[PDB]
């Protein structure tokens, strides 16, 4: 479990910082999207969001993230179907909030361990 956190952390940090550098004027969504814990890390609550933004992001990093989180998922656990905002500004806020909360979850879980 510490192993998956450490594998994911550079991927998450890079995705967030690259978005902060490339995207200008992204509004605050004020939404909670990712549920960090279940109490173990909550792959089934986090995974659908990454599946939903895969076409909008770096598919290669996303695929690595998904492969890591799949290892922390019960096969029986169902995944919510995610609604990605269609409006361009809402869609960037949606992506940005996912990256922020994923970063925060891993940092939180790491302090736990």
């Amino acid at each position: 479990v510490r192993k998956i956190i450490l594998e994911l952390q550079p991927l998450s940090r890079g995705l967030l910082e690259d978005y902060q550098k490339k995207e200008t004027g992204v509004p605050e969504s004020n939404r909670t999207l990712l549920l960090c814990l279940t109490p173990r890390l909550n792959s089934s609550a986090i995974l659908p969001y990454f599946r939903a933004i895969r076409p909008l992001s770096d598919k290669n990093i996303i695929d690595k993230i998904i492969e890591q989180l799949d290892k922390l998922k019960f096969q029986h656990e169902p995944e919510t179907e995610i609604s990605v905002p269609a409006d361009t500004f809402e869609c960037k806020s949606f992506i940005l909030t996912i990256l922020q909360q994923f970063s925060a979850c891993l940092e939180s879980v790491f302090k736990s361990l």
Partner: antibody
Amino acid sequence: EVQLVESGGDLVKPGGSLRLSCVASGFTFSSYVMSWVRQIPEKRLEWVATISSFGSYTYYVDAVKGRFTISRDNAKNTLYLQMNSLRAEDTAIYYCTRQTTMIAWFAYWGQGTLVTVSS
Amino acid sequence: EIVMTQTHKFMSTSVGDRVNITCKASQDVGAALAWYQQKPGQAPKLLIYWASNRATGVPSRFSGSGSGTDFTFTISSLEPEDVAVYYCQQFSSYHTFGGGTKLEIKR
């Protein structure tokens, strides 16, 4: 509630140095871009510097490049402005601010810390 | 570097009047403009972003319009607590602020 509290402003002579700190509470500090904005006595606002979540990217306004250094310590929820080779026109209230990406607007401001540079 | 020009340093208004504050950018910034209000002894407060989105809790008498290079900040009916300095700011590229427009009461 989101809170930013600046400290470290003081009087200094031209060519001196000073270190500003901003301690943040009420949000996950490492999730956000952080920035400094200053306001000179004539009340013009000037953006100063910006740092991404984990320090990989920084931008500086030309007036302070090669003299000021922005940095952050995520463990301590603290943003820093290291100010070297200070000049009189650096005299200003320095505000700590939070942003979503590196080029954006400033929705959260601290109360400011006054820096006075004078011979 | 994108220069933001607020032509009027000061404007006289009367309570109950419409106020139009103008800001022009030296190059196209699209809608990537923000408006701030500042009262003495306080930090600036965000009012409008993306030229016309009113930030949370901002009174409905405040509004912004424009896209491109010419922007207008509008108070539909000035209230006494609205006496302040208003600044525009572009975030199309590296941050720059207009020089401020102080509202004062005509008598």
